[PDB]
Each structure stands twice: as structure tokens, then as C-alpha cells.
Design a protein around this nucleic acid. Structure first.
Ligand SMILES: [Zn+2]
Ligand SMILES: [Zn+2]
Lengths: 50, 118, 88
RNA sequence: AAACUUUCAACAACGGAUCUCUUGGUUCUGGCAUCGAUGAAGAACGCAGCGAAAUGCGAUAAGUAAUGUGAAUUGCAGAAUUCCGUGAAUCAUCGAAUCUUUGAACGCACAUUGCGCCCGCCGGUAUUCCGGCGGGCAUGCCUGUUCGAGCGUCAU
RNA sequence: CGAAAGGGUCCUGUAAGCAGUAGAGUAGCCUUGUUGUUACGAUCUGCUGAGGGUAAGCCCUCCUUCGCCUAGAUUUC
RNA sequence: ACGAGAUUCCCACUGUCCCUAUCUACUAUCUAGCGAAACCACAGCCAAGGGAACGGGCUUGGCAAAAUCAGCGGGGAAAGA
RNA sequence: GUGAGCCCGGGUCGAACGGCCUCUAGUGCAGAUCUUGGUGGUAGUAGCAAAUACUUCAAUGAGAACUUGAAGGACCGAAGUGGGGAAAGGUUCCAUGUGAACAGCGGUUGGACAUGGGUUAGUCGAUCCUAAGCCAUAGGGAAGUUCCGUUUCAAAGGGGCACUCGUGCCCCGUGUGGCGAAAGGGAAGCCGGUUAAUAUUCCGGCACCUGGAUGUGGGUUUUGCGCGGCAACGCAACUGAACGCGGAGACGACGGCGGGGGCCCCGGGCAGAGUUCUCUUUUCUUCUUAACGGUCUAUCACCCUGGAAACAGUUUGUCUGGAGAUAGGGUUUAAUGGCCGGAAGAGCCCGACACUUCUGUCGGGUCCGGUGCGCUCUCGACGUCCCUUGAAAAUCCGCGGGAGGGAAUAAUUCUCACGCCAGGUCGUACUCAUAACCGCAGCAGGUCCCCAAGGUGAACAGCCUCUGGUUGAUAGAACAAUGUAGAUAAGGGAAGUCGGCAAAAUAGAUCCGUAACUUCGGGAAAAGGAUUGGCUCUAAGGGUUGGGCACGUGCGUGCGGUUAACAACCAACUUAGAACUGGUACGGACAGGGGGAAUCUGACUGUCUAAUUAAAACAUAGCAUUGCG
RNA sequence: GAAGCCAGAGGAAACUCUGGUGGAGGCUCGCAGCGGUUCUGACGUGCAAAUCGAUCGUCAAAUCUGAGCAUGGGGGCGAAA
RNA sequence: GAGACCGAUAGCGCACAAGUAGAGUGAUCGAAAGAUGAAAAGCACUUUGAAAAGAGGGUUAAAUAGCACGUGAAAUUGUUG
């Protein structure tokens, strides 16, 4: 809701900052095995569980 | 013209603390205005009638107005009405007079008993 | 109407976030954590759940102080500086 | 006759078996005794020039000091190193430190970044007001100190 | 051959508009009633078996108009 | 008195039949795009016989000609049977 | 080679492997409705059919039914497909860009993907208070994790005075703390403007609350702590500790009646727009005024005079009065009322110029009335119901008391006016649903609230419309069978079928009329009948204001009169009656009882087997028994 | 259209009749809401692991409903299935 | 430090950002998933396409190794005979 506690808003802020694709330079590193963000979240797919 | 309105606060329920009235603005718009509950007239401590001459406000609004607006220039003014004050005065005077009379009668009876014993 | 129609009335929360263990297991009306047992002083664990014990046992986290203890033991819990070292 | 269905073959598909590999498991043996109110285990939130995670770290934040080694790091960018040196490095070691909010968790609370109390220091006109900063204030029990209570036992 | 149009044949039921000494009554102006008059007023009458529709699986039309045409592609003892 | 309680009858009423017909929409149908599942030993024309009251395959006959579309509900399949 | 198998050739491939004798085992598969993974036929098949519906041109683009602009046609129809919120979600919000994947088609579009941006408060919430309730403390249980306990079998602490036997004395009693509501209680903010996206938060103007310090003016006082009024009480002030009293906070449901705001409706006027074959002095749009203050007023009630039967006053509703009515005169609670400040300078409407942009500039106006069984909110006075009587606390004020403190070296410890200073922390985007929540989903389900226009009509019924939203749910063609949904049918009228299942018939309103039975309340809209359109008239039902003389001088007396039974002005919706007129229909769509005779059964209203049974089951009031001082 | 109330006509009074007024009820028709009676209903690998249409019950209260809180499996709660 | 153990459906659930992703109100439940090449030398340049890509032409010892990547079986499919 619009009404939210500071703790809940801090968790939402961390989730918003985590929500991104990986930088493209990650794939060019020596011996890289990361191809995409396997922990990517979307607001319609998986709940944060708060 | 748009005639329908909305609440201006986040309470959506028609509770006793969510009273609104409709105004028209200088901008020509129909709007709500959130208002407080009506003030309550102070009442007599003896009979419970509404006290004449005293404003009816919410309780903390009485701290902002001066003393002569909150009281009546009489004993028990702003706390008891005039009829109850008159009853108090008459009852007090008559009961103390009756106490004096009873004390006189008791002294006379005691003197008669002492004279009979002696 | 005990299925799909009744599932539409689910908009409350039995559990919130626990301050001690971080899970969504703090019963909002009992103020008692189902996972870690907060606010009791002991952390809740049972021998009938080896998996639950191993999910939270020592070493599953950061070991911020405990990981430095074996090195200090190996060097004998010594104090001081090397001889002739730069400093104050 | 073709098409269709089926059979056989070659090549091409589909799929991931087989073979070979293994910075991983599994079992056995040998050695060692070292968590925490001097705040642990665990949790949350942060920290890189360019990172979401894993890793490392804590506002001194992919780290500081110190010791050792002795020329890198590297995906890009940018800089190196007086190379005859208080010195690179995502190096090793590690005795000095830093170590946010919490948690046995400790002013009272916490579904709140809520409300206090004591003592200093600094700033804003400032004896009164406002603000910032620092150090403190849990419980049970022990030893001692000091202040007490009770015809409980006495002396005078 | 096609699209229109005209004529026929069917279906409905008398168009819009104008007019009327038709219209229960009401209100004005004056000759104060002698269609007194003017205004309104469902409706009625006339122009008007009128208007509208008519092949989409109705009919006719070298001689009422306008347009189209000897292709293209595929295959075959 | 009240009743989405159970029952019999009467008047009205009518496409419940008699006895069926016609109209409209959405499907079904055809096309473009998109696109499953149930089920599946192998397969699917019958008749008589096949001791154990059962034949789809065996015996003896009838027969029997590519590849297909809309329907259909006799078997065969099909009931979280 | 009988066989399980063994060996070789050819092709592919890229790093290890085999024979013999012994040793060793997790050592040999077709089945286990196995286990895991992968793949077929079915099959380009079943469908992709609820929520009325789409079309034209242009642009963009490789490509357009489902992108955009314009042009049309429709729907939601104010209990919305509208405008905002609570829960829940958490960036879905805004801008720019976009291959694939997703949006059961398509996609240039997107809640998808990529990069950035966006949430501003002393006044709105939280924060404070307590509610139902929950947890510490004392203390007692329990092997113990822990259980009870929340005022207790607790030394559970506040204030004042003191120069002396200086290292004390006095007063008081109430207990014990914390958590617990973004719908309860509660200090205070409005209007205009502004962004791509926030705004009672930003900007501008204009205010308020709380707390603190200390001035000026005014007030009080030499009769020390104001004056006036018969009174109700008034006025800018006008001392007031301990300890007490009282009020507010603070309160049910329902009924009609009256006041006020807003909405709806009607008339005129200026300005603009549309219609214009004909008609229409026409139809439509703007015409507004906040918080905060000042002033004048507004039901109840209270005060003064006086003394009422020939009882009077008086509501829609029969209450009030010698416990003092009526009447007359006053005092007051109560504004969302009138006027004024705010404030026309704003907002809105119209016009004339300027204008590459940057940018605008200047004129004119924004007015006056009416109505009501209307709708909605609010206030007031009444009334009804209860074997039901409908929170608490924080907090604020008044009073009783008279402790202290107080003046002419002037004093002031004045709830008056003005002035000075200060006000921390989060939360604030967006959705709130036929795509932002839950249901495995962008699921025809479910999920708490306000605000709610015009017509018809009894009516937030159904149907049509305005503002504001949509036009989103795979599309094109054809019109076989069988379906689903909606209809009609001559004559007969239940012959059908287990059974009138289904359908049809009835239905609004006015009037006539209405049986048995009955717990006398009902039955009852029983039954059975007569009517309803349009037009032109008639009648009835209201409001406001207004009386002649004689003196003093627009008010005071002394009279005189109840034909004002009259005039003037204003206003609305019902009801009844009559003529004329169309007709196959007149509650012309919509909306809307079929009725009757009986039987069984449970008294009734109510409740349950969420997802096969709604009932003679359960409950119920009434009745009866038992136990307990 | 219950009590209460007004008027008129009677009655010695109590009361009786007539016309109004008033607005009672776990009364009634019925919109929303709540519920869930019926239909050879739709749907039956559905829009849906209970949905859709028409119809129906109730609709001023033993009515409907949110949040906070309480009762926990040898249990609870139960107008009782 | 080792093994007459297992060799990615085996061996711990986990050889990989595994007690992760994901699910459940919760207690808890809990995967899948390794291999281009010696070296990225991971295809310059030309050309066709809106693009994805295709064709030439290089790189490599090999593209019959093209970030769908060692080998590449069967079920099942396409073309050709
Ligand atoms: Zn009184
Ligand atoms: Zn926990």
C-alpha cells in the first residue's frame, strides 16, 4: 500500500536495486560462466514474500 | 459541470472523525472540506441543564479563549446555573438556622435535665 | 465455494518478518516466531529435523569472528608486533 | 503410372545415449583442542570507476596497518615502476586496528528507524530557546563499601 | 454479358407541404356580436389508390443509356 | 396464520402433443493464422465351427480395388468405473 | 560358433585400450498402472462462439482489423466500463528506445524488454490515548523447556521546611510498568498556480496550533485584587497554591416534522456557439467566491411583570400551566444565514492586435431574481422500543477554598491587543481490478468504502440520454444436418407424460365487490367484475402585505370597529367533472400476482450438511423436572 | 394500519357507534445486498478442482459486513449436519 | 594422508552464483543444470535481405568443432533411390 513501514520500504529499495540484467562486460571475462541473471525478479512472476 | 467529489484524506470510511461538507471554490470547483465534530454545551453540575452564556466547543478549544467568556460573574458561575445557585443559598441558610434552633432546644433540654437531677 | 471463490478472501497476514532470523514466520498475533522461536532466548531447533538444523547451523552464515580463531590458535593467541617493525 | 501407407539403404534432422575426461562426492586412517556480555552463532542493510549473484569486506567497507615476496592486474577504462625501489599485486603471511542495524541482546519499546533519563563538550543573539556531538542508564548472584530500617538481643 | 433506367406485376395504405365559412372549446380586439373577427386547437376534408418498396431465387425492353470482350495461367493417349 | 415441504382435483391457459412447419443470432462448415488432450500389445468386413456356453487372429465359406470429406452413434474404444 | 557371442572389412571419430591365468563385484532386462528423460499416431484435429460493433482517409513502418491523428457509428448510463481510497502488490508510474521471447491471433503497440527519471508536510496519517486482549515485575508451581500471576502475603515515593542540641523535622496516600486501533478518541491550512511524472507537502497570497522568553500599549490599585444589569447575564482585560466538586472528551436503533449548505428545476440580461426548406425573440455554454476573522441575526431554554374556569396556549403527531400558563418585555446555546475584510488583484467567458522562436500585450464582462411532500449531507425539537438502556483513557476548561503574592521610591504573579523565538522522525509514485490483489495465468470466480446528473415512472426498477470513459476481448466468407439461445403457428385444447415438466395465460393504477374458517389479529390483492390514449376546457384545494379618530410628537397614550366577508401582489402540484377525437392495440415498449377446492405436515420469523440431500431435521417462545444458601 | 389522541352522535355513568389522526410489527410486495429453490437448462480435458443464465428465498431484523482480539487436534467451535 | 569405492539418471540433495531457484500462511518441502578449440585464431571483406540470417570468401589440423558448440546411439522426422 501507500502506507508502509520504513523496514518494508528498505527491503523494497534493495529489491529495486537488485532488479537488473547483468553488465555486458561480465560475459567477456576469462573463464566466465555467467550468462544471465538467474535471480531476476518481476512484479508479476514471483512474490517478494514480505 | 463536474458535480461529484472525493475525500481529501486517506480514510475512505464514513466514520465520526471523517465528516465533510461541500464547498464551491473561487476557482469554480466543487470540493469537500473536512470539518471537526460539533462542540458540546457545558451543563449544570446539579440539574444537567445547558448553561446559558457559555460557548459550545471541543474541549481543547477552551484553553484559547479568555476567562470571562468561559464563565458567568456569579458564585459557581459557568459550573452551576442560577436556579441551582439560588437553591444552594436558600438551603444553606435555612439549614444553619435550623442547626442553631436545634442547638438551643438541646441546651434547654439539657438544662432541664440537669435541674431535675440536681 | 470452498475453493476458487474462497481463495479471493486471502488478503491478511498470519506472519510478518522476524527480527532475529529474517524469515516471514513471525506470528502477528502471538508475537512468536515459528522458525527460530523469537522472543525466547534459545533458538528453536529439534532433532527430528536434521535438514532444518543443517539449514541454520554454524558455518551456513558469515562466521565474522569465528573464522579468525583457528589462525590465532595456531600462532598461540600472541600479542605485539614483529621485532623492528615500522609503527608508533 | 502418381499420390498415400509400409519395408530397405544413404545423407540430413530430432534427441542426448555411448565412449573418454573430473578443481566433486564417498569411506578409512593420522594429527589438534580453539566460540560468546572484551558481545558469539545467526539475521538485515550496505561497500568496487564500470556488479545483479557467488566471493571478500564494514562508512578506515572487493578494504587500512604491519611482515614477507619482488613486478603486476587484466573484461573495458584509467594509471603504473625513478626497475637499482619505504615497492606493483583480486599476492602470501598476519601479532596492530576499523568492525553499520541487530541478535544471548542490555534505558523502555519495536508490526514504530517511536519515547525517555543522567553527565559533559561544541555551535546558533542566548541565564531561560534551538541544534549537533561524546560517554552512560538490563536482570540474577558473589565479595567489599557506604547510607539505612526494626524493643530482634543488650549496655549506658 | 454487366450496371443503371423505363414499363409491367406484386406489397403497404393515402407521403411532405399547403389550404379550408370542417373542428369540442379557450383567450384577445373592437362593429359588442349579427359564420362578429383574430389567435391556438387532437382530429377531419382536398390536392392523393397517393407516397414508398419491388429480386436480392419476379417478368419484359436489338428499336432507353453507360461499360465489357477473341484473355491470363495449368495440364493432356 | 405462515411455508422454494409432500399429494389429489377444478377453471383459465397454451406446440405437452395430434403433427409437424417456418424465421433470427451464435456455432457446426470453408479459409488465413494459431494449435492441445484422452487413449493406443498388434490391429480393425462378415457367416458357421472352434466341449471348458469366449473370439478379431485358427478351420471352412461369403468375398475383396487407391486416396478422401460431412455426419452418425450398432459396436470396438470411452465413467478420476 | 548349435548358442549366448567372437573376429574382420568400409565409414565416422579423436586418446586411450585389449588378449591369457588368477582375484573381486553395486555384473547380464520386455514387462513391475515401472524410475528419469526423450519421442510418436491421434492431428494441422478438437476448437480459438458469454460481456451488442465496427467503418473511411492520412501518417508511421519490411509488414497494420486489433499503432496514432482526424472522420463516423455504437456501448457503459451516476448501485458506471466514471472520479478517488482501505487491504494486498512493489515501480507495475513518466519519458525515450526495442531483435528474439510473452501478450493462445497479428503487432510498428504493451503492465513485456533496455536505459534513465519520478514520491518535498509543525497543520494529512503514523507517532499519543485507552478498548477487547497480550507481556514483564512480586510471589507461588513445575525434573525442565517454562506455567500461573498484572495488584498480590513487596520496605514498589512524591512534596515541603530548616541560623542552633545545626547534620534534622514535617505533610500526603493512589497505587504501581509496558504493548495493543493508518475505520474508535485526538492541537492546528485554505485558495489560486505549477510537473513528463508529486503536491491540503512545491511556488505565491492569506492564516492557524503548541510551547518558551520578555517588552510596549491598554487595564487594575491611595476604598488594594474591574464595572454594569431587578434578573437571565454582559463587557478587551479584571490575582488565586494545597486539597476538592463539576462539565466536556462520551456515545443505541427507528419514525415523521422543521432550519441550513450543495445538487436538480424555472425566468430575465450580457457575451459566445449550434439550427435555420419552413418554424423557433430559439437550443446550448460561462456568469464563481475558500480557510480564517469582524458584525448583525437565527428553534430549545432561562429571566422580569402579572395571576389564569366561560380553562387557556399549542404540534402533522396532545403535551404544557398557581411547582405560575397566556400576554407583553428581555437574556442566552446554536450558522453550512445576511453584509464586510480575505477579493478580484484570483478563476472563468468573450474580443482586438502581436508572434520564426524567445515570448505575449491590451480591452470588455463576470449581473438580477423565483420555486419545492424533490435528491444528498448536516443541525434542532419531538416521539417510539427494550427481562436489550447502547466504551474507556489521554486531554482541556469552569467552579468551591483562600495559601501566597500585591501600590503611590509607584506597583502589577492582567486567561486583553500588538510584538519576539521555535517546531525533529518517517509514509506520500501507481493499481485497487473482465490485465497491477488471491485463485499455478493478463482466469466470465472472489475481495472493504465513498461522491452519484437529465427523462419516463411510486421508485438509486427496466429503457434512452449528458459529463467522464471505452470501442478491449483471433478475423474473412458461406447459411447443410444436429445443436445452444430467442420466437411464431390454423383446428382441437393435457388426447402428451410417471407427473401440466416446460411454455402460455395473470400482472401497474382507479372504482364496484369479496366466502368458509379463525388464536378475532387475520384470511384478503381472497373470489368475481367495470375502466385506462390524445386534445380542448371546467371546478376545487394556497401564500404575503394592508384599517378610522383626538392630543404629545416616524413612536406614546385615550378611544372607537370586527363585512379586510375587501383590495393589491405572488405561487405550485395534485384531485374530480365534461365535451370532442383516432383506434386492430391506450399500465400500446419496459415493468409486472394465474386463481380456486382440499389432504398430510412443522406453530410462526430464523438456522445447517462450502462442492449431490433446505427438510416433518435443528433452534425458538411456552411448559415440566432435577441439583445448589 | 396496533396503542395513544381529536371531533361528532348516543348512554345516568361505564362504555357504544361514526369520521379523522397517529405510525406499531423478529408484518408484507419489492431494488441493491445476502442466500441458493427449480430447470430432461449452459458448461462436463470448463471462463471455473463448483463457473454461467433464467427462476426462486429473504430484504429494518435471530439482517449483511471490515479490521483488531480470543478459542488449537486426547483439542476447539457447533440454532447438531 | 589415503582407497581392488562412484564417474554427472552414478557419487552427498548440491562436481555449476545449491540448501540456490522455486513452492507453502507456516512448521517445512526442495530441484534441474559439467565438456568449442592447443590457442578465440569466436569469421575480415563482398553480396542478398527490414531483420534474424543466407551465399561467397576465410580462421583452424579439423567448422564432418560456429559460444544451438568433444563424440553424437535409439525412438521419431525430411529428402533421395
Ligand atoms: Zn442547575
Ligand atoms: Zn525468527
Amino acid at each position: 500500500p501507500s502506507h508502509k513501514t520504513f523496514r518494508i520500504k528498505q527491503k523494497l529499495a534493495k529489491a529495486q536495486k537488485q532488479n537488473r540484467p547483468i553488465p555486458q562486460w561480465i560475459r567477456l571475462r576469462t573463464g566466465n560462466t555467467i550468462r544471465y541473471n538467474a535471480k531476476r525478479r518481476h512484479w508479476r512472476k514471483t512474490r517478494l514474500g514480505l | 459541470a463536474p458535480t461529484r467529489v472525493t475525500y481529501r484524506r486517506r480514510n475512505p470510511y464514513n466514520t465520526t472523525s471523517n465528516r465533510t461538507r461541500v464547498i464551491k471554490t473561487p476557482g469554480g470547483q466543487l470540493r469537500v472540506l473536512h470539518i471537526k465534530k460539533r462542540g458540546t454545551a457545558p451543563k449544570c453540575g446539579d440539574c444537567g441543564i445547558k448553561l446559558p452564556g457559555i460557548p459550545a466547543l471541543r474541549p481543547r478549544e477552551y484553553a484559547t479563549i479568555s476567562k470571562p467568556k468561559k464563565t458567568v460573574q456569579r458564585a459557581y458561575g459557568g459550573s452551576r446555573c442560577g436556579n441551582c445557585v439560588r437553591d444552594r443559598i436558600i438551603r444553606a441558610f435555612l439549614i444553619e438556622e435550623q442547626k442553631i434552633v436545634k442547638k438551643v432546644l438541646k441546651e434547654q433540654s439539657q438544662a432541664e435535665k440537669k435541674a431535675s437531677k440536681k | 465455494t470452498k475453493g476458487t471463490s474462497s481463495f479471493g478472501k486471502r488478503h491478511n497476514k498470519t506472519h510478518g518478518l522476524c527480527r532475529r532470523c529474517g524469515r516471514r514466520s513471525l506470528h502477528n498475533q502471538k508475537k512468536v516466531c515459528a522458525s527460530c522461536g523469537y522472543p525466547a532466548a534459545k533458538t528453536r531447533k529439534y532433532n527430528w529435523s536434521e535438514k532444518a538444523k543443517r539449514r541454520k547451523v554454524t558455518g551456513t552464515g558469515r562466521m565474522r569472528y569465528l573464522s579468525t580463531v583457528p589462525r590465532r590458535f595456531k600462532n598461540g593467541f600472541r600479542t605485539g608486533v614483529p621485532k623492528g617493525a615500522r609503527g608508533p
